[PDB]
Amino acid sequence: APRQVLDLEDLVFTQGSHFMANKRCQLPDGSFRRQRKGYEEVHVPALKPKPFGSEEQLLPVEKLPKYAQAGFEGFKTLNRIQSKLYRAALETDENLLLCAPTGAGKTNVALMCMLREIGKHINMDGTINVDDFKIIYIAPMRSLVQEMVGSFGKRLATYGITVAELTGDHQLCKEEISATQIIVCTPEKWDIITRKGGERTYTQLVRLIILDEIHLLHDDRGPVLEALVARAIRNIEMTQEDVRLIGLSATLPNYEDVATFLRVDPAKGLFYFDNSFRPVPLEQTYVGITEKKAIKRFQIMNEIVYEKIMEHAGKNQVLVFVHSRKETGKTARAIRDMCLEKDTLGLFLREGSASTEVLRTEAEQCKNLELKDLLPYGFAIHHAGMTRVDRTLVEDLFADKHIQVLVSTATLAWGVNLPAHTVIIKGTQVYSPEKGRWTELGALDILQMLGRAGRPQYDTKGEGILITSHGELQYYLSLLNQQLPIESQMVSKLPDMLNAEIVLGNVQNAKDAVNWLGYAYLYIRMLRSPTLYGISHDDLKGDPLLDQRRLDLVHTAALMLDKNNLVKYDKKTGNFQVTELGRIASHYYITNDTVQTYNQLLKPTLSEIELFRVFSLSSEFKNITVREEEKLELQKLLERVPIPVKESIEEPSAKINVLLQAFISQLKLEGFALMADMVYVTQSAGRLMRAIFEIVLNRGWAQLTDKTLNLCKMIDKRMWQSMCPLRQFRKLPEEVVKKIEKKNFPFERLYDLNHNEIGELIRMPKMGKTIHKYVHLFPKLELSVHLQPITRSTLKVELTITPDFQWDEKVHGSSEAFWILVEDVDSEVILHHEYFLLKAKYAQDEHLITFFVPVFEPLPPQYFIRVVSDRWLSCETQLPVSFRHLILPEKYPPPTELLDLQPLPVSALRNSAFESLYQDKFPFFNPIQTQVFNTVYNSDDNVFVGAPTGSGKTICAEFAILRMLLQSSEGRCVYITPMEALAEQVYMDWYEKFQDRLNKKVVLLTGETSTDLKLLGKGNIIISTPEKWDILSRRWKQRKNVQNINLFVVDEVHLIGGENGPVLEVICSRMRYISSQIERPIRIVALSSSLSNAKDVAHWLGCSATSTFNFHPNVRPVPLELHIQGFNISHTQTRLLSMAKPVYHAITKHSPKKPVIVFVPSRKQTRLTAIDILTTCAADIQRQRFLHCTEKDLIPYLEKLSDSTLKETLLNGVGYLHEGLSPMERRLVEQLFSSGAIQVVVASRSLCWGMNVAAHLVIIMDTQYYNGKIHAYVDYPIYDVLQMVGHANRPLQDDEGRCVIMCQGSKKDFFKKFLYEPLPVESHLDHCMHDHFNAEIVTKTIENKQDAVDYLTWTFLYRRMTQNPNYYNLQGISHRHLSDHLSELVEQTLSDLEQSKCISIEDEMDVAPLNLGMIAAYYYINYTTIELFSMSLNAKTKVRGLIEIISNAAEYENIPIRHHEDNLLRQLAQKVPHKLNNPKFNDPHVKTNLLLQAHLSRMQLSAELQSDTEEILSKAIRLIQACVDVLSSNGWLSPALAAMELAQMVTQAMWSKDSYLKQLPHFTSEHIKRCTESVFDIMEMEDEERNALLQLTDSQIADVARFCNRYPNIELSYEVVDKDSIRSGGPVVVLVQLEREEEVTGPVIAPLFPQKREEGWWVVIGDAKSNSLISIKRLTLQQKAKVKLDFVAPATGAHNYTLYFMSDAYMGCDQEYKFSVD
Ligand SMILES: Nc1c(Cc2ccc(-c3cccc(C(=O)O)c3)o2)c(=O)nc2n1N[C@@H](C1CCCCC1)S2
């Protein structure tokens, strides 16, 4: 559409607050003019009290709601206005606009609104619900902010409510917000907060916003209120969460438009009370001065003031407002010296001089200043240059009616409520630093000042006098008489406001901006007064929505923003692109011109002089000039300030410069204009310097980062770097510090001196101890670095940060912030940086910060790591990091070239039954599959395929499997994936593709060993995870089906570089070894992500170079488009929230019509992010835009879902996937996503391996997750990210994939490295060595230290050690170094294994398995775990003790601690049978203990705790069985039996002492107390009273029936062979026999136990008195078994024994037979 560049200087209201659209001004009632020839006097009488309306009453506090009476104490009766508003405010949620006269007591109105909100959260149980809500009170003045905080604090204190001011800071704001229910603050402050884009972390709980002095709209600051409200309203649209707006305004024209602006219903929430509703009727007098001359005008003024004080003698109190703090005393002195006169009126004011209050004001002469002179006369002064004691004194003496005449500053009017009867305002002229001139006093100030006239309980009438220049009388008449119209200044600030809305992402283009302007006060005002705003009535008539004017305004502003490089704007499409300068400009609230200035002048080599100059050139200061009259003082100041102000003479630039230096130096000033200018530059200075800091930090300029950060800290602490750091402690006597400075010696030394030596050094021996204290209060960090080379271009750094200093809540508060800076050898460039927060609770703990730095092969000597405080001056530490001794890894070879072969057809596979698996899906294989097709399908040799996830590597493995099936139809193939999820997917796919169609056997290995051996027996294709195949193939010497396998396929072998990688490496190695120790070679096919060193993997696995295919990530068949989006927010919650809008924009930009997966860190974020995508969609007025079916069509599917929110989001086209959903529900959401019915799915990270789903676009929402064990957020494994990115692939539908990674900025570089380029992997087996060595020693593959050294040579470790020595901590790549290092490895491993009694070492060479080592190898348990068992187990060990011991296993170390899990585990700790002693709830072993007890009690838990419980239960059995073996091996009966009982009761999920009938499904608790029992005697199988005593389910009859046909049936015979022929010391043989009725079909049935187990039994012989286990055997039943138990007989042959038969599965099946021997 046509755009016109406007002249904005034409359309703006120049006069700002002083602008009057007003034409005439009509004076109320009778009114009159008196011409005194020095001036004219206009009188306006009080207005009469309009009679009451029908059903209207002043409303005593007793009548307003119960809970609300508190806070209103001290008030017996609500004010008239307040009474009319009390129903609207308290009983409705409607938005209100209240226009009231000055003085109307709006505080109580706002308070009623607040009390309405608070009243929802009453929480009748306790006091209040504090964390459910937040209230925001916006006030225009800092003084008023402080006042309101005090007031609301006192009045609401009864409700247990925190009310607080918001003081400008990065972090302290964040957590002081969280603790605060009522935040009081200024418009631009809340603007700065809600600009940050992660704004919702502050605003999400805000239910109420009160705008005080909303007529500020008319002021030059008004556009801030416009931005605030526009933003809030639109956000209410987008979150669908309601927020109430309350405006409070003066009585002025246009108020109905202000009502429209705030969206208040005129018939509901609009209340306008004219001046007559004022609670104290006000008489007005307007003086104005005829002509221009000098002192005569001021003399006239003083005369007016005196004449008017005189008319109130001992009668009333007079408050007089002056515009300077020195003028308070000047005028108050002038007036009482004018009171001497002819015959003195000097004290007519207290003629109550019979000493009354007269000696109260004269007893108060213990005071200071000008007060001491004035007070005994009843005169006083009030300003901000006084002190809280003197100001409180003046206020108190004026409130007690002691002080009669009080002269003061506006600060009093805003800051405290103290009305006088009479108010005189002198001159209405005030200095404005930002306008740089003297100007007419702000309208808000006049209103607030005259609002102090008359005292609500003390006065029948109030009075006020406004002394002004004669011209300008009509303005103040207009203002106070309700004729000065409220207009919109938005045109003035439009470009900055537009930029802020672009940065937030609320405006993506010109059209969005037009719609945005539609929310502004400007839109309404332009509609209703087009001519005033420069619009033709013709235009308006043809364009009622002002499309043209809005588009023009926006075009103009966008050209301005584009010019100054805050935004990229093309005039054709009208799209906007945020820039970094724009983002900083918005965030730090700096004007766009300033940003262009900084961007021009800022450079890496900028000096400090030039830095001060650049700051001085900020456009915030553009109206400042140097006056002649202040020149001299500037000169003096220039002399005492340290930084040269270069030869710029006094132009404004140098004036600003010197004023800032002087502020830093704390020089005192005289000139009032010079002082005002100083306060103005310096209050802005912190923000501006912080902006320059962020610019240069993010550009990587080290020197200027240091300078600017320093300047920030200097401006905040008001001291130069030159001075003593101890100045930053305010409690330190300043001459002690000056003493320290004058000594001239490094501050650093002070650290190492004792207090005696310190006091000695400073010549102040008395002070040495305190100074020592403060030296050690000063924040200090110690730094440790650990270098691991990754590639020739990349090093990994672990920075260990150790706090060395004493924390003080008074000094350091809740946290301390630092910057980690990684700089080059010349300290000119910041190579890496990140924010680091040291929290108070986590102090004294070490912190580990991991990051990656670039290096360049002509390697420097060193880099530098500086850790620098964000706040404190001269608080820093530097760590050199030396590259001298570094060995860069070996250059990795080029990737395999992708040759363009013809896209080979499915027919090249020559078997048609094979081709029927493919031809339906596709005609041709992709380039990766064609290039490799010959080698894998046609050859027999080992092959490596590297390629980006989604290159279709799986059917390469399928090629190999088909060839195997051609070679031998009975052949055996084993397949390995690191992930169980991957295994199950591959299982479903390959079961269909092989077992169904090709009719071979396809099996998936399970937890249990025997059934897995059985499956390995049956299997043509065997799917497994590494540990399952590990426990299987350890015994390969004795297992031939392990030996004979035709094909070994290992998938995702790059996972060797990850956690659990060592087991993968070990089993692959073992397979290579087996292959070379036997006749018929086992083939190896390895599939991987693109690896930088593929050769090492290939060689390791036996692949020739021709059989090695390693493809670069950019040859991925469906080309990927990757975008990495950085967010500089260290706080994860805030970062996540700030990602919400980028997620949506990513969807609508990169994949508007096509399917989209969004991955999020956690369960709750799935739901949240889905709901956001929902509401945001709806708020583009495009809803169901992601629903590509009819809502009706889904219903039959949605009825199958349990989750309400999921039903709702699915109705809108957005599904989600988290661990809390059932497998069915998950499959359902997947099916719906795949069919294209829903366009968007949001999945938690834990499901990324378990999703069979593809998208056009994958969005990764953050990269980090909480680790509660280290109390920190940690990064995603690169493998998870690679899989996730791999999910955007659709070869049939799409011509490309698209992926957007949104991560913390400090992480961006990392992802640019290991995503675009191929991934290096290393081995971690050298930290895992013990269990594997132990295993191979138990099978006697390692018989000695040489055997160990040779075992290592089959590993990937062996290859990588000479490739990247420094990574493994080798000091050379030589064979000498390799042999040495491997020898130390072998040595320490074998030694540790011996100390744990796992192995035996003879002659320092030979090794042998001991008992524990064999246990650990058999049950697959870590050596430290069985070592621990053997140490903690004894003859006295019981059930409780056994649970406590097994929970302490090493397997359970890896149980995670999630965010705020300590609370939930504390509550769970209170709900369990066994209390834990002083438990730490971030302890995974405590957690597993509690979850074990939880599982026994059948307590249901959160989804995460449930999955954790699953993982625990999996290995619980093997741990228990190990305890049994250890316990019996020591010959202890009772604890072993206890262990068996624990095994049963862990399997069936029931406790030790309880009804045995709980095993039967659906039976619970109080169901029946029926008989008062045993499932064996309950089943004499009857038919019986199942009707009579039960609660009768139809389904559970079938399930219980299914249980009893499974549930163990057993009877036992035994003979001890050759009874009495056995005599002492000789063999005793007890033969036991198991034969059964109702033979076995199916596994053990244990619904609550996750894995599918086998029945197993212990036949035990023991003496039940001496607690001696005399013999033991373990077996399985099936049909029949023979059981022989042999043991040695004692002397004196009368001896009595016991025979126990116990299960591992069920309870109640235990049997005992007593007997006798010899
Ligand atoms: N001009 C006054 C202002 C202006 C003003 C413009 C931009 C801002 C501002 C900008 C950024 C952040 C904040 C923040 O709150 O963090 C604030 O703050 C103010 O905020 N508070 C007061 N102001 N005047 C005083 C009274 C003192 C006796 C004489 C009459 C005025 S109280």
Swiss-Prot record:
<feature type="domain" description="Helicase ATP-binding 1">
    <location>
        <begin position="87"/>
        <end position="270"/>
    </location>
</feature>
<feature type="domain" description="Helicase C-terminal 2">
    <location>
        <begin position="1142"/>
        <end position="1350"/>
    </location>
</feature>
<dbReference type="GO" id="GO:0016887">
    <property type="term" value="F:ATP hydrolysis activity"/>
</dbReference>
<keyword id="KW-0347">Helicase</keyword>
<keyword id="KW-0508">mRNA splicing</keyword>
<keyword id="KW-0682">Retinitis pigmentosa</keyword>
<dbReference type="GO" id="GO:0005654">
    <property type="term" value="C:nucleoplasm"/>
</dbReference>
<feature type="modified residue" description="N6-acetyllysine">
    <location>
        <position position="568"/>
    </location>
</feature>
<dbReference type="GO" id="GO:0004386">
    <property type="term" value="F:helicase activity"/>
</dbReference>
<dbReference type="GO" id="GO:0000398">
    <property type="term" value="P:mRNA splicing, via spliceosome"/>
</dbReference>
<feature type="domain" description="SEC63 1">
    <location>
        <begin position="578"/>
        <end position="883"/>
    </location>
</feature>
<dbReference type="GO" id="GO:0046540">
    <property type="term" value="C:U4/U6 x U5 tri-snRNP complex"/>
</dbReference>
<dbReference type="GO" id="GO:0005634">
    <property type="term" value="C:nucleus"/>
</dbReference>
<keyword id="KW-0067">ATP-binding</keyword>
<keyword id="KW-0677">Repeat</keyword>
<comment type="similarity">
    <text>Belongs to the helicase family. SKI2 subfamily.</text>
</comment>
<keyword id="KW-0378">Hydrolase</keyword>
<keyword id="KW-0225">Disease variant</keyword>
<keyword id="KW-0175">Coiled coil</keyword>
<feature type="short sequence motif" description="DEVH box">
    <location>
        <begin position="1051"/>
        <end position="1054"/>
    </location>
</feature>
<comment type="subunit">
    <text>Component of a core complex containing at least PRPF8, SNRNP200, EFTUD2 and SNRNP40. Component of the U5 snRNP and U4/U6-U5 tri-snRNP complexes, building blocks of the spliceosome. Component of the U4/U6-U5 tri-snRNP complex composed of the U4, U6 and U5 snRNAs and at least PRPF3, PRPF4, PRPF6, PRPF8, PRPF31, SNRNP200, TXNL4A, SNRNP40, DDX23, CD2BP2, PPIH, SNU13, EFTUD2, SART1 and USP39. Component of precatalytic, catalytic and postcatalytic spliceosomal complexes. Component of the minor spliceosome, which splices U12-type introns.</text>
</comment>
<dbReference type="GO" id="GO:0071005">
    <property type="term" value="C:U2-type precatalytic spliceosome"/>
</dbReference>
<dbReference type="GO" id="GO:0001649">
    <property type="term" value="P:osteoblast differentiation"/>
</dbReference>
<keyword id="KW-0007">Acetylation</keyword>
<feature type="short sequence motif" description="DEIH box">
    <location>
        <begin position="212"/>
        <end position="215"/>
    </location>
</feature>
<protein>
    <recommendedName>
        <fullName>U5 small nuclear ribonucleoprotein 200 kDa helicase</fullName>
        <ecNumber>3.6.4.13</ecNumber>
    </recommendedName>
</protein>
<dbReference type="GO" id="GO:0005682">
    <property type="term" value="C:U5 snRNP"/>
</dbReference>
<feature type="binding site">
    <location>
        <begin position="100"/>
        <end position="107"/>
    </location>
    <ligand>
        <name>ATP</name>
    </ligand>
</feature>
<keyword id="KW-0597">Phosphoprotein</keyword>
<dbReference type="GO" id="GO:0000388">
    <property type="term" value="P:spliceosome conformational change to release U4 (or U4atac) and U1 (or U11)"/>
</dbReference>
<feature type="modified residue" description="Phosphotyrosine">
    <location>
        <position position="306"/>
    </location>
</feature>
<keyword id="KW-1017">Isopeptide bond</keyword>
<dbReference type="GO" id="GO:0005524">
    <property type="term" value="F:ATP binding"/>
</dbReference>
<feature type="modified residue" description="Phosphothreonine">
    <location>
        <position position="1362"/>
    </location>
</feature>
<feature type="modified residue" description="Phosphoserine">
    <location>
        <position position="1595"/>
    </location>
</feature>
<dbReference type="GO" id="GO:0005929">
    <property type="term" value="C:cilium"/>
</dbReference>
<keyword id="KW-0832">Ubl conjugation</keyword>
<dbReference type="GO" id="GO:0003723">
    <property type="term" value="F:RNA binding"/>
</dbReference>
<dbReference type="GO" id="GO:0071006">
    <property type="term" value="C:U2-type catalytic step 1 spliceosome"/>
</dbReference>
<dbReference type="GO" id="GO:0005886">
    <property type="term" value="C:plasma membrane"/>
</dbReference>
<keyword id="KW-0539">Nucleus</keyword>
<keyword id="KW-0747">Spliceosome</keyword>
